[PDB]
Paper text:
The arbitrium system is employed by phages of the SPbeta family to communicate with their progeny during infection to decide either to follow the lytic or the lysogenic cycle. The system is controlled by a peptide, AimP, that binds to the regulator AimR, inhibiting its DNA-binding activity and expression of aimX. AimR is a transcription factor that in its apo peptide-free form promotes aimX expression. In this study, we deepen our understanding of the system by solving the structure of an additional AimR that shows chimerical characteristics with the SPβ receptor.
AimRKat apo crystals diffract to 2.4 Å and belong to space group P212121 showing two molecules in the asymmetric unit (ASU). Both protomers are almost identical with an average RMSD (root mean square deviation of Cα carbon coordinates superimposition) of 0.7 Å. The protomer fold was similar to that observed for AimRSPβ, consisting of an N-terminal three helical (α1-α3) HTH DBD followed by a C-terminal regulatory domain composed of 19 helices (α4-α22) arranged as 9 degenerated TPRs. The two protomers form a dimer in the crystal, an oligomeric organisation confirmed in solution by size-exclusion chromatography with multi-angle light scattering (SEC-MALS). AimRKat, AimRSPβ-I and AimRPhi structures show dimers with large contact interfaces spanning more than 1420 Å2 in AimRKat. We have therefore named the AimRSPβ-II conformation as the “open” dimer by contraposition of the “closed” dimer conformation observed in AimRKat, AimRSPβ-I and AimRPhi apo structures. Further, this structural comparison also confirms that AimRKat in its apo state exists in a DNA-binding competent conformation, similar to the DNA-bound AimRSPβ structure (RMSD of only 0.87 Å for the comparison of both dimers).
Residue numbers in the entry:
A (entry chain A): 0 to 386
B (entry chain B): 1 to 386
The structure:
């Protein structure tokens, strides 16, 4: 038993024989034989990578990272299981596991593993902004892809870049070229890619303002997965889809997401900030404000709370202080929106609309737009701006 | 034996002084390369401009025939064949270009093979036979060595970005281009520079930076005598002035129209733009096409009736047009005309929506100006154009 997971399992089985049939059903097996094999013989893998992930999530939930790191670094890089490990690591944003698997798969002599390694490396580089979308497609081309799996993943990696540049027409063009039924042997990879695609589509529809479609895609993703990363982003999207229409559903979706985020500080932050904004926008008591942070976004949330409490003079002073510092366009939109709530000047709301339009934020633009309608501006013309 | 060499030998027999005339027009300090070109099969000039300039000067009416024949018998492995390929693509001489492409991918010379493969990707992307992602993937597959094709592969992607109206990735590719890396091929460097100035010109025309637009179009005009680039540069300058200065718009279109002489297709762009310009500024219009069955021309007829307060005839011809199939840009214009006839705000609002849906940041100004006249808030109208 070289791998940490095999050591723990043999140990726990010595104390409790009934675990064997428990772990068999949790892994999806009709019969426990592959599990006897896994425990006894070095290098014996399950046919599907979900078998081991499920056993680890169930029996050692607190120890997932340590156990999976050790298990992945000990896999034969030439196998289906190592190729599945690479997807698992990237999905969970376990970049240390992933980068080690990538380097050793590019080295190996197996054609399949080499190609997956080279393609995931392109995805890593594009994510980090070390290359742009055109260098990335050029590298995809250089590689002369053979597998149906990497044919699909090369399209998805380009979609990720298109998503974070807010450029949706080319995303849909790439989506159209994907056919998941061509993944014939690797059911773990097919299911994981399907989860990725449902999340991506969810974010598309959220920006194109089809709120119903957005929620349906986010739910499809939630149903298909137990990966923390995808659960977190799906609930974040659902929360956001409700901001303007239903305080209570927005909040509860953020709280469910926050619970799934437990023990990842970075994921937890997204929910705290969104909750802070939500509670301010709907004039509710706000437990989420960060009074210590000197990041612009957080300091704006403190101004917004002063405004809800009719402390207009203090809000104005902190807002003038912020004007001194460098702000991008999205922050300036928010800045002028707050100024408008204090002073009731139409000009501030107009500037706010301009800044949000210039920064390509199709969500926050609704805030000064709602105010301008309240001040008697023409609804028919306001609607045209959001198109 | 090339037709151009036959004509030149013939004209030289009658006039010995042509030799020194053709030498200076070709940019050579000394006539030797020209004696060589006439006498020995396969001898090329160092620069492709040499032969283009001789042909433009001595046989202006025969450019297409002479250049077609010359290019089809070139040594495909040479600098001159690589320059021919640029010349043909710039002029949209697709016959010449496709023949050079096929025979350059055949040859064993690494440089010519790479140019051929890269121009072929440009041709395929233009025709919509592939999308922008297949095109970059093919660029990658090729393993490009030359600095020339490194640059041109970026420009071919710019062309596709332009036709899809997505300008941010164009600018990203523009920033990666450095023309001083083209060390040896002066003809190609100058031609690529022309292409880039035209592309930037059209960017800024859509992003409403009108002064930048004109400056780039002028830079292109200064650098070129290719009729295609002259025509599109003047068309762009004309268009940049539509809303702000009738007279400069008109004069820029008339200079463009003169450069278009003897290409009916190019001439049409100017006639239609002139027709629109005169209608928009309520001037007597000599440019109307009463015979054309194109939507855009039939709209110009309606617009003229409206300027003459012939409202009931305009209404009848407008109802006729509504029956027929129209894209969004035409529908914008359709509802604008309806609004001028009926004075309904609804028609102007729809007009704005159709122009916004069709990504036309210019024509949208027309119903916007009307809405301001009807008392809608100018401050909010300005945001819709931005």
């Amino acid at each position: 038993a070289m791998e940490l997971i095999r050591i723990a399992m043999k140990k726990d089985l010595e104390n409790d024989n009934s675990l064997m049939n428990k772990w068999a059903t949790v892994a999806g097996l009709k019969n426990p034989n592959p599990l006897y094999d896994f425990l006894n013989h070095d290098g014996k893998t399950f046919n599907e990578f979900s078998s081991i992930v499920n056993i680890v999530k169930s029996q050692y939930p607190d120890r997932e990272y340590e156990l999976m790191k050790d298990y992945c670094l000990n896999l034969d890089v030439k196998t289906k299981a190592a190729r599945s490990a690479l997807e698992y690591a990237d999905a969970n944003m376990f970049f240390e596991i992933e980068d080690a698997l990538i380097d050793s798969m590019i080295s190996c002599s197996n054609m399949k593993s080499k190609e997956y390694g080279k393609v995931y490396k392109i995805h890593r580089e594009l994510s980090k902004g070390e290359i742009d979308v055109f260098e990335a497609s050029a590298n995809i081309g250089k590689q002369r892809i053979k597998t149906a799996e990497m044919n699909i993943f090369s399209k998805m990696l380009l979609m990720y870049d298109c998503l974070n540049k807010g450029n949706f027409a080319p995303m849909m063009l790439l989506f159209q070229q994907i056919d998941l039924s061509e993944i014939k042997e690797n059911r773990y990879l097919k299911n994981s890619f399907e989860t990725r695609i449902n999340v991506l589509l969810s974010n598309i529809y959220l920006n194109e303002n089809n709120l119903e479609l957005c929620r349906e895609y986010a739910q499809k993703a939630i149903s298909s997965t137990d990966t923390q990363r995808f659960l977190v982003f799906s609930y974040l999207t659902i929360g956001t889809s409700y901001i303007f229409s239903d305080f209570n559903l927005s909040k509860q979706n953020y709280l469910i997401g926050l619970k799934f985020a437990k023990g990842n500080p970075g994921f937890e932050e997204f929910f705290k900030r969104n909750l802070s904004f939500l509670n301010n926008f709907w004039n509710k008591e706000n437990e989420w404000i960060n009074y210590d942070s000197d990041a612009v976004t957080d300091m704006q949330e403190v101004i917004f709370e002063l405004i809800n409490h009719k402390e207009l003079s203090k809000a104005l002073q902190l807002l003038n202080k912020l004007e001194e510092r460098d702000q991008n366009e999205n922050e300036l939109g928010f800045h002028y929106y707050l100024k408008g709530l204090i002073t009731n000047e139409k000009e501030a709301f107009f500037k706010s609309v301009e800044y949000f339009k210039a920064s390509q934020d199709k969500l926050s633009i609704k805030m000064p737009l709602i105010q301008l309608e309240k001040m008697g501006e023409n609804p028919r013309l306001l609607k045209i701006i959001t198109m």
